[PDB]
Symmetry: C3
Subunit: 242 residues, 3 copies
C-alpha cells in the first residue's frame, strides 16, 4: 500500500464522513514518513551516513571536516588548505602553478626557459643540445659567440677591440694565418695557438685591436683538419650570448 495523497485523505475527514480505522491508519503512516526519513522507526538504526539529527529535531549535514569537506551558509564546499598547491574558483578545483611549474591540458608540467639550456619531454627534464653554448659563454665571460659545424668562438669586448676564445668542432681546427680570420671583414692583429708538427698551428685565441663584436657582425674563417689538407671557408654572423 502507498498512502493516499493529501487531497484524497482530506475528504475522508470531511464533514459528515465516517472516518474509519483505515483512514486513521493512513493518517498515522503519512505522519510517520518524516520519522522513517530520519531513520527513527523501530528496526531502524538512526540517521543515514552523512546526516545528523539535532536535539531541536533538525536534519543536519555531517561533513567529515578532517577529510576535506565543510558546510556553511554558502553550502557544501571542498576544504582547500590555502596556499598549499590547490586553488578553487567557480570553474572548480585546480592546481596552482608556482615558479617552474606550468599547468595545461597535459596536466601539471615543468616549465623551462629554453634560452637557459633545459629541455622537458615525455621522458623528463634535461639539458638541451645547446646548453653547452651558455656554459662556454659563462666560462670566458663572452657576450657574443659564433657556432657552426667546424668552429665555435666566444667573443669578449675589451679596451678598443675584442678577443675571442676558439674551439674546434667535428675534428676541425681554426687556421692562424693572417687573412684566415676576419671579424667584420678585418684581419686579426694577434693570435695564440697550439702547435702541431711541421708548421701546423691551431688558433685558440684571436684578437682585433679596433674591431668590436656585436650581434650581426660577420665572422669569416678558414678551418683545417689533421687528416686532409683541404679547408672549409666559413662565413657566419655573431649572435648575442644566451
Amino acid at each position: 500500500r502507498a498512502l493516499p495523497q493529501a487531497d484524497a485523505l482530506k475528504e475522508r475527514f470531511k464533514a459528515g464522513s465516517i472516518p474509519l480505522q483505515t483512514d486513521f491508519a493512513d493518517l498515522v503512516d503519512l505522519a510517520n514518513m518524516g520519522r522513517q526519513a530520519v531513520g527513527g522507526t523501530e528496526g531502524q538504526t538512526g540517521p543515514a551516513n552523512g546526516f545528523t539529527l539535532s536535539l531541536e529535531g533538525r536534519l543536519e549535514l555531517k561533513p567529515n571536516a578532517a577529510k576535506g569537506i565543510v558546510v556553511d551558509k554558502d553550502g557544501i564546499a571542498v576544504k582547500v588548505e590555502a596556499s598549499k598547491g590547490l586553488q578553487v574558483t567557480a570553474s572548480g578545483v585546480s592546481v596552482q602553478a608556482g615558479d617552474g611549474i606550468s599547468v595545461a591540458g597535459t596536466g601539471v608540467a615543468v616549465k623551462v626557459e629554453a634560452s637557459k639550456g633545459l629541455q622537458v619531454t615525455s621522458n623528463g627534464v634535461g639539458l638541451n643540445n645547446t646548453a653547452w653554448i651558455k656554459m662556454m659563454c659563462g666560462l670566458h665571460n663572452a657576450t657574443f659567440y659564433v657556432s657552426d659545424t667546424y668552429v665555435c668562438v666566444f667573443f669578449c669586448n675589451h679596451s678598443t677591440g675584442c678577443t675571442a676564445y676558439v674551439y674546434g668542432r667535428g675534428g676541425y681546427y681554426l687556421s692562424m694565418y693572417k687573412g684566415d680570420v676576419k671579424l667584420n671583414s678585418v684581419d686579426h692583429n694577434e693570435i695564440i695557438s697550439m702547435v702541431g708538427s711541421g708548421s701546423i698551428a691551431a688558433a685558440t685565441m684571436v684578437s682585433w685591436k679596433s674591431t668590436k663584436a656585436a650581434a650581426g657582425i660577420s665572422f669569416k674563417y678558414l678551418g683545417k683538419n689533421l687528416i686532409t689538407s683541404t679547408s672549409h671557408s666559413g662565413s657566419v654572423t655573431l649572435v648575442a650570448a644566451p
Copy 2:
C-alpha cells in the same frame, strides 16, 4: 516523551475507540517531525546549512558551486576545473602529471631524463656529476668519448678516420710521443699540443687518418704529470656520446 510507533498508534484509532487528547497529541507531534527536520517549526531558523527548501516543499542540497562541489542526476560531486592540473576517477581525485612530472606514493615529483645530465634529490633538482660529459660532447660535436681518472677524450669521425679533442684530469696530461696514444691498437698520425719546458708537451688534438671511433673500440694512452716523471698506462674503451 518518545512518540509511539506506527502500529501502536494505529491501535489507539481502532474501530470502536474514543481517541483521547493524548492520542491526538501523539499524532500531531509525529506529523510535526517532517516540519522539524526542515527547521519549519516555531523557534527554528529554517533549513540547516547545506540544504534548501523548494516551493514544492522538497528538501534539496545546496552545493557551494563557487567552491568545488556540484550535485546533478549522478550524485554529489567534486567540481574539478577541466585540464587545470587535477583529475578524477572512480579511484578518487589525483594530480595529472604532464611532461617532466611524475606521481607516485612519494607525491608530486620532477622526472628528469636519465642521460641528459640532471638530478632530482630531496634537496631539489640539480645537475648530476657527469653533466659535463654531455656538455663537452656538444661543444666539439663529438659522437664518442672516453673518460677515466687522468684524461677525457672526445672523438669526431670525419673523412677516412677521426680526430679527438683531449683534456687532462686529476693534474695529468696526454703524452704526444708516437706510440703513446692508440685507438684500436693503432698509433696516431698527427697531433697538436701545448708546450711546456724543454721536451714537455701535452696533446690537445690527436688524429688517426684511417681509424674510426665507435662504441667498444679501445683507447690506450700514456698519461703524464708535471710533478713526478712517472706515467700512467691507460686502457679504456669508447662510449657513445650522451
Copy 3:
C-alpha cells in the same frame, strides 16, 4: 501556513472540525513533500536517495570523488599526489617540488635556477662543469681568469682558462699559490714572446679553501697587466 503543533493540539483537546483534520493531514504530508513523494513531484532531489525502509540517504557520486561513510561526507582522494588533513586538501610535494604561496620547482649549488619564466641554468653552473671536466676540487674565478686545482702527489696542478679577453702569464714569479712561485707550466704560444699559461703546477704546495691565488693577467690588445689576488674555494 499550517498551525504550530501546540496550536493543533488545542483543536484536538479532551469534536474536531474538518479544517483541523485538513491541517493535520497537510502537516503529516510534509515529510512526503520533502522526499519528493507527492503527486506532481518527481521523487527525491538530486544528491538524495530514498531507501526501501523509507530513510533519506545521500547519493555520493563515487566516481567523481565524494564518499560518505560513518565519519561523514568526505573528498575521496586517490593515494597519487594529493593529501587531506584537518586543514583540507592540498598537494603532496615529492623530490624537486616545494609547496607554498602555488606548486613550484625546487632546485639545489647544483647549477639550476627557477624564476617566473621557468627552470634554467644559473650564471655559475659552468663552474660545476669545469670542476667535473678536470676533476678539480678547488677553483678561483674572477673577471680575468679562472683556475681549477687538482691535488696530486706532493703538490698541485691547475688548469687555466682566460676570461674577458685575458690570459694568464707564464713568467716565473707571475703565478703564486700560497705566495709560492710555480715550478712547471704548460702554454699556448703567440707572437714574439707572448705565451698563455694553461697548466700550472706547484710540486710542494697543496690547494685548499682559503689559500691565496695571485697572478699576472695579460691580454692581446694592450701591454698592461692586471695584478690579481683571490682565494681558493671548494668545488661545488
